Each structure stands twice: as C-alpha cells, then as structure tokens.
DNA sequence: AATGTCTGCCCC
DNA sequence: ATTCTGC
DNA sequence: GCAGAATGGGCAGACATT
C-alpha cells in the first residue's frame, strides 16, 4: 500500500520497497510521501537520497512516468522556453478549496493566512487513486485553458483533484498549484537526485533489472567521487540544455555517460546565464580576485536578452529565465544583419536590452522599458526603442565558447560584431587593477544612467561554465556600500501574516513616510527582507501591543494591500533602497512630482531599528520628493 | 466598451 | 530583485 | 559558499465584472 511507502528507508530496494508494481502507473501518493520524507529533514544530502530512491523505482518500474515525476518535484510544467503557466493564484485556488469542502471562501482565506500554508487547509477540510502522470497531465490541462469562462473550468479540475486525494496528496497538490512547494529541495537537488538514480539504477534493463545498485561494488570513497563525476556530467549538460524534454529520452535510451554526445549547446535552445554575486566595496573585489586580472563594465538597467542566431538565419531571443521573448523584440530581429559581419553564420550573444530615447540619444529608466508590449508585437507599433548593450559571446559559427576564457570571448565579440550608436554597442569597459580609477569608474557609471559596475576576471576562472560556478561575476552597486546608498526612516503602520518559513508571525510590513503638510502618514512600500530570523521575532514581540482593530484616520494607504494587522504608528525603521520610482498605488508624496502618482522604493530592505526617532521625525514626504528628483 | 482584479518557471 | 540560514 | 526560500515595486495581458 502506497501509504506505508518509505523512500527514506535504509537499504532501500527500488523494486521490493517500491509501493507499486512493475509497468503500473506511478501513484501520486508515492510522490507525496517522498515529499513528506524530504520535508522531514534539512540536510540536502539526506533529501537527495530520499528523492533518489523514488526516481530509481520509477526508472526500474515505470520509465515513462520519470519525466512527469521530475517536473512534479521541480514544480514546473515543462521547458521554460515553451511558457506553460498555470494561471492559478491564491484566489482561484482558495475558491477551489472552498467549493470542494462547501466551506465559506472567507473562512478558508482566513485559515490560509493564519497557518501560512494553503495545503494544510486543503487536506484537513476534505474515485480512482491519483497517479503522478495523471496529476501532472491535469496540471497541464489547467495551464492550457484560455478565453472567457476559463477560470471556471480551472476550478472544476482542481476540485476533481481534491475529491480524489488521499492522506497527504491534497497538501502537495495545493502547494504545487500556488507555486510554493517549499520542500527544501529544488533544481540543483533534483538534478543531483537524478544523476544518483540513473547511476545506481541504470535505465534500459530487461525486467527484472539485474543491476539494482551499481555502487555496492565500490568503496564508500569511490562511490562518492563517482557520483560527483556523474553529477557534473548531468549539470554541465543541463546548464547548456536546461530542457528535460530533450535529456530524459536521451538518458533513458543512451545512459548518462553518452549524454554530452546527444544533448549539446546550440543556438535555438536557451542556456543557463552567468549570474553575479554582490560585492560590498572595491577592496572586497581585489580580495576575491586576489591576483587575477579583471575588467569593469557598466551595469545597464534593463532586461537581459540572450540572442540566438541559428544556421540559415532564424533568430530567437530568450530572457534571463529561458523565457521566449522573440516576439517581443521584432525591431531587434530586423537589425541582426546590421550587427554581425557577413562571415558570421551563427552565434549566441549575452546583451542587456535598454530603453533608448532616439530624440535625446540617452538611456531611459528601466520603468520606460517595462511599458513595451510583450506578445505578438508589430515593428511599426513600437514606441519604446531598445538599444542592445552586448557584453559576452557564448557561441560563434558553430563553435561553443563556454569553456573559453573571457579575454578570447570578448575579443571575438568585438572583432565579429559592428557597433551602431543607439542600437547595438559593446558595454563600456575598463581593464585595470588600479584601485583609484575603479572608484572613479563606478562614480562615472552612475552618472551615465547605470546601476553600477560588473567586475569579471579575464583569464583566471573566467569561463562560462555555470555548472562549475553559477555566480562567477561580481556586481558592484552604489547601494551596496555601507554609507553611500540612500537610507530612509519609515514608520511601521501595518503587518502581513507570513507564509512558509514566516508562518505564525509577520513576514512583511507596511511602511509610511510623514507628510508634514497634511500631518498624515503616507504608505510608501512594504518590507519583507533585511532582518534576521531573530530580528524578525523581536519585531513580532514589540509590534504585538501596537495592534489595532481599525486603522487610524491620519494613515492613508490608498491602493496598497490592506495589512492583516493594523499597527499603531510607533516604530521607526531605517530602510535602504537602490532607487525611487513613481507608484501607481502608493500615496507617499503624491502631487509633489506627478499629479496622480506617488513614490515608492525599489528593492527596500530593513537595516536597523531607529529607537531615537518618533513618527513625526521620520523622513518627510517632501524629502522623498527631493530624492526622486536627485536621480535626474 | 469601459472598468476592476488578479497573475506571472514576469521583469527587475 | 535583496537578504538571511543550515549545511 | 552553495541552495533554498522568505520577501520587494511595477508593468502588460488576461480575464471578470459592470
Ligand atoms: O542584480 P543582478 O544580479 O540581477 O544583476 C545581474 C544582471 O545585470 C544585467 N547586466 C547589465 N549589464 C551587464 C554587464 N555588462 N554584464 C553582465 N550583466 C549585466 C544582466 O541582465 C544580469 O542579469
């Protein structure tokens, strides 16, 4: 019986200890108890093994269900470049839970907020038993629905799933739909669990499988080294081809060793991009890079654009998360011939799409870029022009450059691509170890309409192998410096019940500034990050007394989300941000810059408490206005 | 045909 | 995006 | 330091409601 399933079992046998029979379809309950055993622990190595045992049983018993069970545990619908989206939020879900249990929607919504988890409500308030491949297909059916009355058809499905739920199945069905699985295990741990499963239990064995455990013959050391090697093979390929629809069929048929022979990097298929770690100062840069030469580049404030040009001429563009944006930039696609030399037959560029004002010939804020149409755009309709700032070249004329140094990669980019003012230009750079010019260059970057600087090594560990290290670059933003960014003292006026980790306490707060004209507290932004788990408990201590049943007449929030608990304006907090913006919902400083829009904070985070200030002495709305203008 | 609300492997 | 935390 | 999971503002689409 799948209820007694225990994948965290010792001496787990993929066949004997499995809770379904060969060929049969993987029960969803077996995928839930696995989630139970993984949620039950915190050492990732323990989670990976438990999930590895489940995958092994799938490979030996129900090969076809391997791909569904993977996505189910990743909580994804498929390759990110396809775009399948549930379209279900807490609203559609909560309504689905209410109708499935006849309860009142408001009663359900309350318990969900209180307990900080939708799945715990869905199961306590509760047909063939659900199957993994079936529960996944339904999830796909949900995301495919469109048009009028589609929201109704979605709830019907979600209800049918909760009606057939058993034991803990409902808990994770609900959490999957809301997008907050939170097992303590995600992409990197799933890939590790997969490489471990296909190595210990190879696929493609005549049943019954002769080789159930391939590591038994090895020593404990040889087994660990062998799993790390096999692990890297998988993760390196995935970073080039993050597409399980392509890998699993190759894996089940040709095994993991042959994988880099069938699934290889190539234009048209998006790849994991190189990310960046934050640095706190110019000194820290030279401390992490030690003696290796590096370069500094502007950090343009736009949207990453991974441009692919396949053999023949087809052009695709992908976002930072492998999302397909080709249809969004029909103007870029028309200028590809203008940026590549006639000898270039294919390539993969790493650029930053930035809003460009062709009248003034200057970069426009990230906000202007956000007003571009996103789907099926006609080139003539375009209103916000975009300028591409190229900073890397990952593929050129059939050759991959992942395993090449940045010096060569940047040299090939500059020699095989043509610059054009206000369309395609190479990122402003500066090769220097001099500690003085860097500080000058960072200051100069902000003056040129950028966030700050990107720092990258040129030869020493300067490859593009996300598998070996995903955060190889360094981002140096002015607001990272402890004493340079813009800090504000804001008033805590409301609290939001937290979810997951924050369940049972405040996970976010509503902050306000002081408008000395009307003598009212104006909400300016919410706050959710910056405080430790300890600091966040003390905030639940000091704020419990200031709780109110009704808001105060001199607190104006307008379109901001109503806090679950109103608070008596008393506590003042220091808050830091990267910039200020015009807000469509916040009332803070409304009328001082824009007629209809107030001012909010981009990337606010808690710093420390300001016991030395009272609400009246908090940052005034007039001050907020002066700050916004200071950005020019 | 406006207006209002929710959603997003959204973008940052 | 920023930030924190167990490993 | 990796991996994971808390949380932010704000936009265009999509869909519900009037
Ligand atoms: O803050 P963050 O880690 O998301 O920053 C990384 C993003 O910064 C963008 N960007 C802008 N300019 C560059 C250069 N010159 N090099 C690398 N990245 C750059 C990217 O869109 C990246 O996702």
Numbering used by the authors: 262 to 387, 396 to 901
What text comes from the article?
The resulting nick is then sealed by DNA ligase 1 (LIG1) to finalize synthesis of the DNA strand. The interface formed between LIG1, Mg2+, and the DNA substrate is critical for ensuring that DNA nicks containing damaged or mutagenic ends are not sealed, thereby promoting high-fidelity DNA ligation. Mutation of two highly conserved Mg2+-binding glutamic acid residues in LIG1 that form this interface to alanines reduces enzyme accuracy but does not impact enzymatic turnover, thereby facilitating mutagenic ligation. Overall, the DNA ligase structure adopts a closed, catalytically competent conformation poised for DNA nick sealing (step 3) and is characterized by DNA ligase DBD–AdD–OBD domain encirclement of the DNA substrate.
As a significant (~20%) fraction of the insC4 substrate remains unligated by the Cdc9EE/AA protein, even at our highest enzyme concentrations, variable conformations in annealing of the 3′ bulge may also impact ligation efficiency. Together, these results reveal that single-nucleotide bulges positioned 4 nt upstream of a DNA nick normally confound ligation by yeast and human LIG1 homologs, but low-fidelity Cdc9 and LIG1 variants efficiently circumvent this guard against abortive and mutagenic ligation. In principle, as insC4 has 4 C nucleotides that could be paired in variable registers with the 3 G nucleotides of the opposite strand, the bulge could be accommodated in any of three registers within the ligase active site. However, comparison of difference omit Fo–Fc electron density for the upstream 3′-OH DNA strand reveals that a significant distortion in the DNA backbone path is observed for the insC4 sequence between the −3 and −4 positions relative to the DNA nick, indicating that the bulge is accommodated in a specific register. In a control mutant LIG1EE/AA unbulged DNA complex structure, a prominent pocket created by the engineered EE/AA mutant is found at the DBD–AdD interface. It is this cavity which houses the bulged nucleotide in the insC4 complex. Notably, electron density for the budged nucleobase is less well defined than the backbone phosphates, indicating flexibility of the flipped nucleobase which is positioned near Pro341 and His337 in the EE/AA pocket. We conclude that structural plasticity imparted by the cavity created by deleting the HiFi metal and its ligands likely facilitates dynamic binding and flipping of the first C of the four cytosines. Biochemical studies of Cdc9 and a LIG1 X-ray structure with insC4 show how the mutant enzyme accommodates a bulged insC substrate by exploiting the engineered cavity created by deleting the high-fidelity metal-binding site in the enzyme.
